[PDB]
Amino acid sequence: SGFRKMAFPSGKVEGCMVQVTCGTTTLNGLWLDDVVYCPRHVICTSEDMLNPNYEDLLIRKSNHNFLVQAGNVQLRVIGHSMQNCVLKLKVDTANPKTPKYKFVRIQPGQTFSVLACYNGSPSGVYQCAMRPNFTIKGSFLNGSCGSVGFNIDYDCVSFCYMHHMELPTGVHAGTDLEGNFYGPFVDRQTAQAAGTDTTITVNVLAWLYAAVINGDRWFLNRFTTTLNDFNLVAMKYNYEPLTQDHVDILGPLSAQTGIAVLDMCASLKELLQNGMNGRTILGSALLEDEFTPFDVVRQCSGVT
Amino acid sequence: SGFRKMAFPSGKVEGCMVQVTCGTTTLNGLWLDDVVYCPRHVICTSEDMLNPNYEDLLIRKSNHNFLVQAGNVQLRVIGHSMQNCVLKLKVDTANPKTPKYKFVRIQPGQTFSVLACYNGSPSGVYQCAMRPNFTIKGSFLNGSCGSVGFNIDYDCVSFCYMHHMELPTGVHAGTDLEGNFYGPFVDRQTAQAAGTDTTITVNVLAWLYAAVINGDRWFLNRFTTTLNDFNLVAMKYNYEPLTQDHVDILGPLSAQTGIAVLDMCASLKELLQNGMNGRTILGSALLEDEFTPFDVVRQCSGVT
Numbered sequence: 001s002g003f004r005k006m007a008f009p010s011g012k013v014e015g016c017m018v019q020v021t022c023g024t025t026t027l028n029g030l031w032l033d034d035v036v037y038c039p040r041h042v043i044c045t046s047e048d049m050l051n052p053n054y055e056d057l058l059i060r061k062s063n064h065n066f067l068v069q070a071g072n073v074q075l076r077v078i079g080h081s082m083q084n085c086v087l088k089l090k091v092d093t094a095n096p097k098t099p100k101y102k103f104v105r106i107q108p109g110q111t112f113s114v115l116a117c118y119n120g121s122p123s124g125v126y127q128c129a130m131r132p133n134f135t136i137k138g139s140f141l142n143g144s145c146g147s148v149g150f151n152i153d154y155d156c157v158s159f160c161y162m163h164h165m166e167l168p169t170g171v172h173a174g175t176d177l178e179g180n181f182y183g184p185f186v187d188r189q190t191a192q193a194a195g196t197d198t199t200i201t202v203n204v205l206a207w208l209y210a211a212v213i214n215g216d217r218w219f220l221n222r223f224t225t226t227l228n229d230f231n232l233v234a235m236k237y238n239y240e241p242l243t244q245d246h247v248d249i250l251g252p253l254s255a256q257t258g259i260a261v262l263d264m265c266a267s268l269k270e271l272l273q274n275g276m277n278g279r280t281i282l283g284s285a286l287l288e289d290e291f292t293p294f295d296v297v298r299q300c301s302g303v304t
Numbered sequence: 305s306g307f308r309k310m311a312f313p314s315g316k317v318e319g320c321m322v323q324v325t326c327g328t329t330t331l332n333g334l335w336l337d338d339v340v341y342c343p344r345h346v347i348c349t350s351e352d353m354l355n356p357n358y359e360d361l362l363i364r365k366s367n368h369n370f371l372v373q374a375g376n377v378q379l380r381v382i383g384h385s386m387q388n389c390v391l392k393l394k395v396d397t398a399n400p401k402t403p404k405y406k407f408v409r410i411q412p413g414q415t416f417s418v419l420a421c422y423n424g425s426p427s428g429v430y431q432c433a434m435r436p437n438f439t440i441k442g443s444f445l446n447g448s449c450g451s452v453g454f455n456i457d458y459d460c461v462s463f464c465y466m467h468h469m470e471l472p473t474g475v476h477a478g479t480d481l482e483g484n485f486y487g488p489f490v491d492r493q494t495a496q497a498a499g500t501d502t503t504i505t506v507n508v509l510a511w512l513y514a515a516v517i518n519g520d521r522w523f524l525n526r527f528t529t530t531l532n533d534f535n536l537v538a539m540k541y542n543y544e545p546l547t548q549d550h551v552d553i554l555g556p557l558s559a560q561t562g563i564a565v566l567d568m569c570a571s572l573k574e575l576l577q578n579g580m581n582g583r584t585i586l587g588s589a590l591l592e593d594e595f596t597p598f599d600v601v602r603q604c605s606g607v608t
């Protein structure tokens with residue numbers, strides 16, 4: 001019993017982190033096979049970041065200008081290319097610790113683990129969600145760029161995020177490993193405001209199932225609702241609309257607990273309208289939305 | 305910027321997890337050098353756990369009755385001994401992935417990372433604190449026993465916890481790696497009620513410093529207090545008494561922020577008396593107490 005914000009074990013990703021330096025800029029790279037992936041802004045001065053022309057800045061860079069260090073050993077860069085907002089540095093040595101991997105582009109509301117790194121060295125691991133406004137609420141200091149987000153399916157690491165930027169509001173933006181930003185963000189130090197950070201309703205409902213499984217039951221009420229009625233309340237409270245697809249995804253938790261999804265929606269509706277009244281659910285005083293239905297099943301079943 | 309509940313990178317500990325089976329009981333072991341450490345209750349049936357005589361049950365066990373599997377390779381057990389509530393299984397092979405390590409017994413209020421494991425396989429990593437009543441609020445299913453808690457100082461893993469038990473109230477109890485339980489708990493399926501789960505005041509104050517560093521400032525008020533005045537309020541709210549030693553430990557965060565420790569205590573006093581009024585601090589609607597002053601400095605400074 002018990003329910004924790006849990007990250008994937010990080011060792012398979014630790015084995016891929018390297019340091020990338022270009023001139024005076026140092027950040028992190030991801031070494032998979034004989035390619036190191038890193039933010040293309042490694043080539044920028046902080047001056048450059050105000051209005052960078054990446055193709056033009058990259059013309060002035062040679063393979064030997066990209067210093068890649070794996071632990072305290074230098075890797076030889078034999079090619080480089082820009083793909084969207086990432087650089088791919090071809091090295092002469094395959095990472096011997098390369099895990100089974102995929103590159104995936106996740107949808108808003110999907111969770112992942114971040115291995116926060118500085119100078120190619122892991123500092124910590126935490127669980128994130130892709131917010132509905134395509135930001136993440138991370139913990140990233142200067143030097144953390146190139147830190148990655150991932151999920152694991154048994155022995156296969158699906159890399160879904162690489163850290164690039166902090167918005168002036170202190171939320172985070174980055175790319176998939178093909179270098180495409182999540183959301184409308186760009187790798188430029190300019191006015192970039194995030195949209196509404198709506199609550200991921202299907203994830204809240206998953207977590208309320210997790211709470212029931214773990215004996216936190218006080219919020220279960222005598223009511224049901226419909227998707228349309230629930231969605232009127234969701235809209236009012238800046239929750240994501242619940243779709244039939246979300247109801248289908250919660251089916252296994254409904255089955256396990258015997259609480260119909262729409263009954264749990266009616267419990268959530270009352271929580272939104274009534275608040276917590278100073279009570280807690282799974283040690284939280286707010287409704288937690290960074291567990292997906294799959295996360296709840298995984299943690300409640302002991303998947304390795 | 306941003307502040308996350310962050311675990312240590314788990315790879316060094318992943319490299320030490322093994323499966324231990326004795327008869328029909330399977331749980332996790334920690335393989336360091338040529339010793340595997342595991343809960344002594346691996347020798348119990350669930351029947352045995354009601355009133356086990358561990359010395360008597362262990363007489364019926366031989367080295368060959370302890371099946372130790374590291375990945376999908378069997379380790380040869382060449383000796384066993386009981387130390388307090390742990391077994392030490394001597395194997396014929398030093399773990400080649402043994403990190404630099406220490407065994408430490410932590411104090412209540414100290415935080416650590418848990419690598420939750422089943423059948424010797426890592427499932428996830430999360431951050432815990434030793435509660436003032438010597439329980440932890442973990443996420444542990446049947447099979448997670450022998451999962452460990454640790455801190456890392458650069459390349460040295462300090463193991464501080466091994467999981468043994470879930471109390472009937474669904475909180476967790478375990479031992480240090482010398483097999484001594486934290487608190488008054490025993491490895492028997494009996495009436496074991498936890499004492500008051502008081503809030504770790506020095507950790508709350510650390511987190512309020514973290515909040516200020518990260519721009520969450522609304523709760524800063526115009527007041528100061530004294531330790532004795534603060535402690536009258538702490539006692540009323542089931543907070544740990546603040547000592548001069550705690551004030552000294554918060555000195556670096558006071559310095560960094562320019563907020564005197566007793567001024568932050570007066571801000572905390574007002575939060576306790578007034579509540580949050582529906583506001584949040586670092587995305588929390590309650591006062592978080594599972595960051596130590598050292599954790600706040602570490603995460604705010606990017607230590608690897």
Ligand SMILES: c1cnc(N2CC[C@]3(CCOC3)C2)cn1
Nearest residue numbers: 011012015096097098099100155
């Ligand atoms: C030395 C150290 N680690 C090596 N690995 C091979 C691939 C992994 C990651 C996925 O499984 C194991 C790591 C190889 N040689």
Ligand SMILES: c1cnc(N2CC[C@]3(CCOC3)C2)cn1
Nearest residue numbers: 315316319400401402403404459
């Ligand atoms: C193969 C794979 N891993 C090995 N390791 C030696 C000790 C560590 C843990 C601490 O640093 C590295 C792991 C050795 N051989």
